[PDB]
Amino acid sequence: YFSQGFNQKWILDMLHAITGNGDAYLVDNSYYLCIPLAFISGGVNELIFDILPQISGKTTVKYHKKYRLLMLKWIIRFTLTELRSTVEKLFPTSYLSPYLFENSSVS
Amino acid sequence: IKLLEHRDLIKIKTWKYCLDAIFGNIVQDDIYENTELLDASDCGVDDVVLVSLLFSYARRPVASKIGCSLSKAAAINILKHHVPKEYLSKNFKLWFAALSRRILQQEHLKNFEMVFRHPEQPHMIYQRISTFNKEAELYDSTEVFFISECILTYLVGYSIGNSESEFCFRDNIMNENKDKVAPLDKDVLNAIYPLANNFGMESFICDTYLSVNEPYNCWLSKFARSLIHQISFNIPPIVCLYPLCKGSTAFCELVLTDLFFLSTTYDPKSCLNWSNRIFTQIAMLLHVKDSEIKLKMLFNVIKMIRMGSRCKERNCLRIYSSLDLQEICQISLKIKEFKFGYLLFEEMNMPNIREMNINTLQKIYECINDGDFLAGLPVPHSIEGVLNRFLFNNADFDANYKESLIKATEDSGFYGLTSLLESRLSGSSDVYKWNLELGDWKLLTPKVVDSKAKGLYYAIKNLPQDVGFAEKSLEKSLLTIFDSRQHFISQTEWMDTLNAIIEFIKIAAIPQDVTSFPQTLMSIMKADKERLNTIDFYDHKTTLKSRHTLMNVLSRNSLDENVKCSKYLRLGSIIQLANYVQLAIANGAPQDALRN
Amino acid sequence: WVNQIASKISMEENEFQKPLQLTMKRLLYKLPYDSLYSVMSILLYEKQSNKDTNISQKIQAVKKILLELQGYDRGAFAKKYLLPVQEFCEMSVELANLKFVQNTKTLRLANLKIGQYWLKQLNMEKLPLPTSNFTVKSSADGRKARPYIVSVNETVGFNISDGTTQKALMKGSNDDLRQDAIMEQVFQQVNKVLQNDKVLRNLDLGIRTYKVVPLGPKAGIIEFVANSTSLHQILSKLHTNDKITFDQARKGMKAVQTKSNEERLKAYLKITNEIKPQLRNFFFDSFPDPLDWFEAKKTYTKGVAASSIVGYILGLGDRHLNNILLDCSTGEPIHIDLGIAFDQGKLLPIPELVPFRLTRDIVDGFGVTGVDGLFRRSCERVYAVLRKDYVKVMCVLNILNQESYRALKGVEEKLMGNGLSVESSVVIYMGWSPFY
């Protein structure tokens, strides 16, 4: 995820670390970590997934989504949210009132 | 609450009585505190747990209660599954006592098959997994909860698809196995590679936990290896198994065992675990070499007992039994009984039933029951006696010239003798028994560790001021009985000690009439008449004598103030004591019938 | 005593029989839900076998009693339960009698085939329970029964409360042939006395268990999954290793034929070679309950500690291992279908010495684990306690020709006699695997 983002900045042990990789096509599954970052990352929103990967196979690009998204939401690392929930609720849901109720509640 | 309460829905009375409180008061004493549709119990245990607060949060305790809302299955839930000790008691514990008699009045083959059934198919594992996921912690916000769901998904999710032909094979057709699991999952389980995200070893687990290495690490069972007895111990035994068949295990087992990094409660599954690991041979005999080496904790022995028990259980199916027939005989026929186990010893006699004794083994045999004649050989022929009644025993004991005679003496009717024979000395921090039979007390206040008849006696004789102030000391005395029992002094049937103090709670103040007072009085008459059960005709004469002492102590302090009630209640008293005698006597020794 | 009430209904309506019948009618009308047996049992045998006396008259009398009861709820409504129950019993009896098709393989079920014993499992709605149990207080409204839930039979394999249930059959069993109901009444007495002694509220044993033996419908000790098996089956199945087992089976035959005496010097004295402690197997392995390995043994032993006194109290015969139950988990052995309630000191060949039967099985059953000599405390108490009430016990047993009197008094003498205190009881006559 982040050394890949560091790119040129990750100049020392990060390059050395390439040698620590398992050569037995670890990447066939291990590359999912970068794709997972793509599911849970933006900025360039490129390179980490697809490109040299692919094989979405419908399922691969789903099985890797739980950890690729079950984290993407978490990635906000934020916590205002109730106010945003009520704003999101503008979509119309009946229970939209619940979002408003949350907005009406103390922080 | 109003928003959803006013949906009305069904049943209503239970939750209505509940919702009506909190904000103010509680009331509904006739009902919620006594004869309401019971909210106390039905299914699960959440009912028995919440109901206590309805007594705690005001309301007249139970008021007089008198009746009930019936029980049956409820009685079971209330006494068996409930037990939420912390603070929700007070009126509720009084309610429990208000139940008392009404409650009492109501009163691995599959693994063995697996042991000698298709070893190639871990069908028992699949059955346990499905059972567990159907009903488990039922939401505790923990990592057990979190992981339980994480792994159920690799099961069924991979099986229903890629396994194709197998698909949680065992009964994944015959009993629609894993259908419930599928309902609960059937999604894109992160590729087993995602086990790296399960916190699991993502590299150690089964590969790392070599069984022989584990045995070597465990060599430090000297003592400092108990730091987690029953925890690291159970886990390590299983970890060893995980390595033993890391390769022989089914596909994607590694994701499971792996993630299971720091996972327990699998103890019931651990029997299936070692049963099919390697299976053919185990020429390490790790469970043999440790015949009795690691002494760090008794639990660990318990697990070892089940280990050994299953080893024999599997053998009896007439299987290969490579470890069992290469295991242990003496020790397996000698040590577990050191502590207990209705099989350490007993089982040891069946394979060991030749011509052998050993005083120590004889002791154990005789100690656990044995029909009071256990191997009753010799003795009489040569030199008899010295075998536990105390009648004669006292002849020769003092013939040459006390506990061996004192209990036996009290059992022979002389309370007037044991009270002198060991009025003090040692072993009897009680002595209360003698004083209660007589009503003397005079022990200052040895209140620490005091129950049954004795607990009643201390509370009973210790009555400051005199009469009129019945309600004040009356409450203190019942509560004392409920709190003393928490040291488990009388634990088993302890709840019956509440009845003696409670009849006093019901008849001590009784300002009503005093001239005729039938209100608690006629009820006691009938209850004692039908007061059959009393465990035995021993406490019947001790807890009862303490109850009689209250009658007389309250009166002793000021029988004259009582005037009109004195006349009636004393008539009621002698009459009931007489009624007691008339329908009693037949229930015990004539010695007591005559002494009183 | 309900079977005695039925037994005693007779022809002398002028006195006693009139109020005796009042009792029978009263109980059948208000609680028919737990009574039928005796009506149907006398009917079935008499119709199939009577060239004698009185029972045929009794049949005509019962027909009139029941004819009126089915028509006297207020009217015919009594029959809604009462006739239906009698008809169900009759149909079942006919079906059992007709089931002796011989065949060969241990199968041939096809459920009921054409019989309405499954096709109509939920036909009589509430399947009146032929046995089982249900009660309220001292009588009260005790018509509340699993019969409602019992309306199930299953096909070519229920339990009223989903529990478990089995049935006894042996390629028939003629209901009409029911006999030795007396032994069953004795079992009722065993438990009855047990409870009469109030100490039962702590004590154990007494046991009993019953079926619908009135119509020869034995209960199957099955479905209970409480380790039941016939005793002779565990024994014949194990009979193998060590020595050879046929050797004593043949000695137990060859040594016997005589026109006077002499058997022990032909077999009893020789079959005693190479005696070592044995078996253990099922009894050791079938219920590994550690804390319960023992409790099961203890429970079993106690049951057997008493049956020794009770069984060997009457002179009840047969037994021969074949009529004894084996069980586990707990387990409480009972006698099955026994008659000839007298010593019978030699049933044809075999000079029986008529001791209580242990036949090695008890000797190892306890000797193996609990060694021996301790059963006494229980047995002495089981026996001695009877003298506390003494006459109370005998007054029932007196009801429950010189040979009958002799045996009865002999039992009284056995209960009392003289020495008592400890006492004892007892070569051997063979045939019945008298070594195991």
PDB file of C-alpha atoms in Angstrom, chain B residues 306 309 312-313 316 318 341-343 346-347 349-354 368-376 532-533, chain C residues 198 201 276-277 280-281 283-285 288-295 297-298 367-369 371-374 377-378:
ATOM      1  CA  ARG B 306     -10.475 -37.188  28.682  1.00  0.00           C
ATOM      2  CA  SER B 309     -10.592 -41.978  28.241  1.00  0.00           C
ATOM      3  CA  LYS B 312      -9.572 -46.444  25.398  1.00  0.00           C
ATOM      4  CA  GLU B 313     -12.963 -45.563  23.939  1.00  0.00           C
ATOM      5  CA  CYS B 316     -12.974 -50.706  22.290  1.00  0.00           C
ATOM      6  CA  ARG B 318     -11.656 -52.817  17.923  1.00  0.00           C
ATOM      7  CA  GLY B 341     -12.630 -39.386  38.765  1.00  0.00           C
ATOM      8  CA  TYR B 342     -15.340 -42.012  39.023  1.00  0.00           C
ATOM      9  CA  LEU B 343     -13.103 -43.893  36.652  1.00  0.00           C
ATOM     10  CA  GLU B 346     -12.987 -47.907  39.430  1.00  0.00           C
ATOM     11  CA  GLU B 347     -11.884 -48.387  35.849  1.00  0.00           C
ATOM     12  CA  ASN B 349     -10.037 -52.307  38.938  1.00  0.00           C
ATOM     13  CA  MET B 350     -11.540 -53.874  35.917  1.00  0.00           C
ATOM     14  CA  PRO B 351      -8.210 -54.321  33.914  1.00  0.00           C
ATOM     15  CA  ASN B 352      -6.612 -54.855  37.327  1.00  0.00           C
ATOM     16  CA  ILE B 353      -8.944 -57.513  38.684  1.00  0.00           C
ATOM     17  CA  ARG B 354      -6.662 -60.293  39.515  1.00  0.00           C
ATOM     18  CA  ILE B 368     -16.168 -44.200  47.328  1.00  0.00           C
ATOM     19  CA  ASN B 369     -19.377 -45.678  48.640  1.00  0.00           C
ATOM     20  CA  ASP B 370     -18.974 -49.483  48.306  1.00  0.00           C
ATOM     21  CA  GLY B 371     -22.345 -50.226  49.958  1.00  0.00           C
ATOM     22  CA  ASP B 372     -20.998 -49.954  53.524  1.00  0.00           C
ATOM     23  CA  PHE B 373     -19.464 -53.462  53.412  1.00  0.00           C
ATOM     24  CA  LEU B 374     -16.975 -52.887  50.658  1.00  0.00           C
ATOM     25  CA  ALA B 375     -14.702 -55.876  50.479  1.00  0.00           C
ATOM     26  CA  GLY B 376     -15.795 -56.860  53.974  1.00  0.00           C
ATOM     27  CA  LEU B 532     -43.222 -33.861  55.532  1.00  0.00           C
ATOM     28  CA  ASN B 533     -39.942 -33.274  53.704  1.00  0.00           C
TER      29      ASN B 533
ATOM     30  CA  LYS C 198     -41.453 -43.759  53.299  1.00  0.00           C
ATOM     31  CA  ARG C 201     -37.600 -40.666  49.736  1.00  0.00           C
ATOM     32  CA  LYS C 276      -9.482 -66.583  35.629  1.00  0.00           C
ATOM     33  CA  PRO C 277     -11.315 -63.211  35.952  1.00  0.00           C
ATOM     34  CA  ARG C 280     -15.116 -56.615  31.319  1.00  0.00           C
ATOM     35  CA  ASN C 281     -15.586 -55.524  27.647  1.00  0.00           C
ATOM     36  CA  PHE C 283     -19.524 -53.378  30.840  1.00  0.00           C
ATOM     37  CA  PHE C 284     -16.152 -51.528  30.884  1.00  0.00           C
ATOM     38  CA  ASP C 285     -16.336 -49.637  27.579  1.00  0.00           C
ATOM     39  CA  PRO C 288     -17.125 -44.211  29.832  1.00  0.00           C
ATOM     40  CA  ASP C 289     -18.541 -41.543  32.094  1.00  0.00           C
ATOM     41  CA  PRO C 290     -15.560 -41.196  34.496  1.00  0.00           C
ATOM     42  CA  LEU C 291     -17.541 -39.571  37.264  1.00  0.00           C
ATOM     43  CA  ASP C 292     -20.327 -41.532  35.603  1.00  0.00           C
ATOM     44  CA  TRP C 293     -18.415 -44.721  34.777  1.00  0.00           C
ATOM     45  CA  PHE C 294     -18.971 -45.345  38.487  1.00  0.00           C
ATOM     46  CA  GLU C 295     -22.316 -43.833  38.958  1.00  0.00           C
ATOM     47  CA  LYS C 297     -22.079 -49.114  38.034  1.00  0.00           C
ATOM     48  CA  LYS C 298     -23.294 -48.032  41.417  1.00  0.00           C
ATOM     49  CA  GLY C 367     -16.163 -58.918  41.160  1.00  0.00           C
ATOM     50  CA  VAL C 368     -14.435 -57.189  38.291  1.00  0.00           C
ATOM     51  CA  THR C 369     -14.672 -53.717  39.681  1.00  0.00           C
ATOM     52  CA  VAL C 371     -14.943 -56.838  44.164  1.00  0.00           C
ATOM     53  CA  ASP C 372     -17.537 -58.551  46.373  1.00  0.00           C
ATOM     54  CA  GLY C 373     -19.106 -58.836  49.818  1.00  0.00           C
ATOM     55  CA  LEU C 374     -20.563 -55.321  49.988  1.00  0.00           C
ATOM     56  CA  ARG C 377     -25.392 -54.011  53.407  1.00  0.00           C
ATOM     57  CA  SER C 378     -28.047 -53.228  50.824  1.00  0.00           C
TER      58      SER C 378
END
